[PDB]
Symmetry: D2
C-alpha cells in the first residue's frame, strides 16, 4: 500500500482499539497497525519529495516510524499477557507519535 | 532516595527541560531523570504497601518505570545527536507516562 | 522484495559494517538493513507456509524482526552520536538475532 | 548494594536461567536481574573513578545498563506470555551485553 493507505489502516485500527470489546480484537488491530508502520517506513511524504533521501528531515521521518513500531511492540506484549485494558490505554501513547510526525511532515 | 524525592527530581528536571535554552541543560536534566526513575524502580508506593513484591500490581507498577527509562534513553540520543528541540519535545511523551502511573497507583 | 532478497541485503550490509573505514559507510549500511528488516516483516517463511497469518509461529517470527529493528535503531543513534566504533560493534549484537531466527524458522 | 554485589546478582540469576526448569523461576530471576541493573546504573566502576561523572566513558557505561534493562524487559514479556523457552534463550542476548561492558570497564 502507499503512505495514505497505511495512514487509513493506522487511523481505522486506532479507533477499533478505543471502542474495542474482546482481546483478539485489540491483538489483531495492533498487528495490522505494526504491518502498516513497517510498510510506511520506506515511503517519501509529499512535503519532502524535494529533499535528499538521507536529508535530516527524511532521517527524522523514518525515526517517527521506529518510535511507533516500538510502542505497538510493547502494547502487543501487554495484550498477549491478558492486560487488554492497559493495551487499549497504549492508544494515548500512540496518538502522541501520530501528532508529532503530522506536525512536521503531513 | 524515597519515592516522593525521586518524583520531585522527575517533576523539577521535566520543568528544566521545557524551559531550557541550551543543549547542556537538556542532557543534564535527562540524565538526572534517568537516575531518579532507576532509583524509583525498587520502591513500593502507598496504595500497594499490602501487596507482595511479586504481585501483578507491583509487576505492572515497575513496568511503568521501564517505559519512562525507555523514553529518556531515546530523548538523550536525540539530544546527543544535535536534535535538541526534538529532545525537548520528548517531554510531551514523558508526561503521558507520568499521568498513566499516577491515574493507577497514586 | 522477497524474503531471500531482504536476507542478502541484511548479509551484504552486515559485511559492509564489519569492514567499513568511515562513518558514512556504517550509517548507510544500517539504514539499508532497517529497510530490509521492515520489508521482511510481512513475509511468510517456507517452514510456516501451511500456518495461518495470526498463528503463534507467525507471531513469534515477526517478533524476531522487531528485535532486529530495535538493535539497528540503537546502533544508528550510536553512529549519529560520533560513536562509530560502538555502532560497528553492534554488528556482534545483530548476528545473535540473525542466528536465533535461523535456528527456529530457516 | 554496591556494583560488585549487583554483578554477583546478575551472574547468579543468569545461571538460574540457563539451568531453569519451571516458569516463575525464570520470571523471578529476570526480575532480580532488572533490580540489580537499575541499582547498578548510578555506580562508578573502579577503572573510571578518575573520570568526570559526565565523561564520554561514564555516559557509555550507563548506556550499557540501558541496553541490559531493555533486554530483561523483553525477556520478562516473553516469560509472562508462556514462551519460557524463548526467555531462557534471551540469556545469549544478555551475555553479549555483559561482555561488551566488561571489555571496556571491568
Ligand atoms: C510520520 C513518522 C508519521 C506517523 C508516525 C504517523 N503519520 Fe499519519 N501521516 C503522515 C504523513 C506524512 C501524512 C500525509 C501523507 C500524504 O500523502 O499527504 C499522514 C497522513 C495521515 C492521515 C491522512 C490520510 C489521508 O486521507 O490523506 C491520517 C488520517 C493519518 N495520517 C493517521 C495517522 C495515525 C492514526 C497515526 C498513528 C497511529 C499516524 N498517522 C502516524 C506521517 C505520519
Ligand atoms: C509509576 C510508574 C510512576 C511514574 C512513571 C511516575 N510517577 Fe510520579 N508518582 C508516582 C506515585 C505512586 C506517586 C505517589 C508517591 C507517594 O508516596 O505519595 C507519585 C508522585 C508524584 C508527585 C508528587 C506527589 C503527589 O502528588 O502525591 C510528583 C510531582 C510526580 N509524581 C511527578 C512525576 C513526574 C513528573 C513523572 C514523569 C516524568 C512521574 N511522576 C512518573 C508514580 C509514578
Ligand atoms: C527471522 C526473524 C529472521 C531474522 C531476524 C533474520 N533472518 Fe535471515 N533468514 C530467515 C529465514 C526464514 C531465511 C530462509 C528464507 C528462505 O525463503 O529460504 C533466512 C535466510 C537468510 C540467508 C540466506 C538463505 C539461506 O541460508 O537459506 C541469509 C544469508 C540470511 N538469512 C542472513 C541474515 C542476516 C545477516 C540476518 C541479521 C542481520 C538475518 N538473516 C536475520 C529469517 C530471519
Ligand atoms: C557495564 C555496563 C556492565 C554490564 C552491562 C555488566 N557488567 Fe559485570 N561488571 C562491570 C564492571 C565495571 C565490573 C567490575 C566492578 C569492580 O568493582 O571491579 C563488573 C564485574 C562483574 C563481575 C565480577 C564481580 C566480582 O566478584 O569482582 C561479574 C561476575 C559480572 N560483572 C557479571 C556480569 C553479568 C553476568 C552481566 C550481565 C548479565 C554483567 N556483569 C553486565 C560492568 C558491567
Ligand atoms: Cl521495536
Ligand atoms: Cl507480543
Ligand atoms: Cl513481577
Ligand atoms: Cl545519539
Ligand atoms: Cl499475531
Ligand atoms: Cl544519536
Ligand atoms: Cl526499557
Ligand atoms: Cl513483563
Ligand atoms: Zn513492556
Ligand atoms: Zn508475543
Ligand atoms: Zn515524539
Ligand atoms: Zn523541587
Ligand atoms: Zn530513537
Ligand atoms: Zn549516548
Ligand atoms: Zn501508559
Ligand atoms: Zn549480495
Ligand atoms: Zn541507546
Ligand atoms: Zn537520528
Ligand atoms: Zn533471540
Ligand atoms: Zn518483544
Ligand atoms: Zn508484564
Ligand atoms: Zn554491545
Amino acid at each position: 500500500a502507499d503512505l495514505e493507505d497505511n495512514m487509513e489502516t493506522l487511523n481505522d485500527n486506532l479507533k477499533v482499539i478505543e471502542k474495542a470489546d474482546n482481546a483478539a480484537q485489540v491483538k489483531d488491530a495492533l498487528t495490522k497497525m505494526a504491518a502498516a508502520a513497517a510498510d510506511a517506513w520506506s515511503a517519501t511524504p509529499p512535503k519532502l519529495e524535494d529533499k535528499s533521501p538521507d536529508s535530516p528531515e527524511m532521517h527524522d521521518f523514518r525515526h517517527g516510524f521506529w518510535i511507533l513500531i516500538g510502542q505497538i511492540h510493547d502494547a502487543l506484549h501487554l495484550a498477549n499477557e491478558g492486560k487488554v485494558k492497559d493495551a487499549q490505554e497504549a492508544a494515548e501513547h500512540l496518538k502522541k507519535t501520530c501528532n508529532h510526525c503530522h506536525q512536521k511532515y503531513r
